[PDB]
């Protein structure tokens, strides 16, 4: 491809996303690590804050990443195939499904909390709250990866 102004804001967006991918996975993995060992009630409410972070980050991605399909075809010349952006779209369309249910547990094991419902139950949903959004996440990472193959192709 040549060089081009349009080309290098998808780029740093790729960039961004990855960034807040890396640091929050640290959240992730620590929060795992945590539930492994089993910590008390008193620190298990850490980790709901922790895991709520990973969410709420996760969410402004996909609204970024809807947006980077957007602008780039907008900004492209030449005969894009309607496929390759779909797929895309598509993968996104996943996304926003299943993070509902990401959202859902996020709001249920909070509203457990409230109510006073015993330890063993709400790190129960920690860890499977856990495991539902490493199935949001390799959504969101492959598509990444999808938007590389297509532009370095052009």
């Known amino acids: 491809m040549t060089s081009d102004y349009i080309i290098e804001q998808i780029q740093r967006k790729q960039e ?3 960034l807040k991918v890396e640091e929050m996975e640290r959240k992730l993995e620590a929060v795992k690590e945590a ?4 910590v008390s009630s008193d620190q298990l409410l850490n980790l709901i804050l922790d895991l709520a972070d990973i969410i709420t980050t996760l969410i402004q991605i996909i609204e970024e990443s809807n947006e980077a399909i957007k ?3 907008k900004n492209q010349k030449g005969p894009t195939s309607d496929y390759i952006i779909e797929q ?3 993968d996104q369309e996943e996304a926003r499904k299943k993070v509902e249910e990401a959202e859902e547990r996020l709001e249920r094991v909070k509203e457990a909390s409230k109510r ?7 790190l129960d949903l920690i860890r499977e709250l856990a495991e539902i959004i490493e ?3 390799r959504i969101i990472r492959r598509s990444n ?3 590389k193959e297509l532009i370095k192709n052009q």
């Open 16 to 18: 961004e996303a990855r």
């Open 35 to 38: 539930s492994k060992r089993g």
């Open 71 to 73: 602008e780039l075809i």
């Open 88 to 90: 895309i779209q598509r």
């Open 116 to 122: 006073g419902v015993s330890s063993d139950q709400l």
């Open 135 to 137: 199935e949001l996440i």
């Open 145 to 147: 990866e999808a938007i």
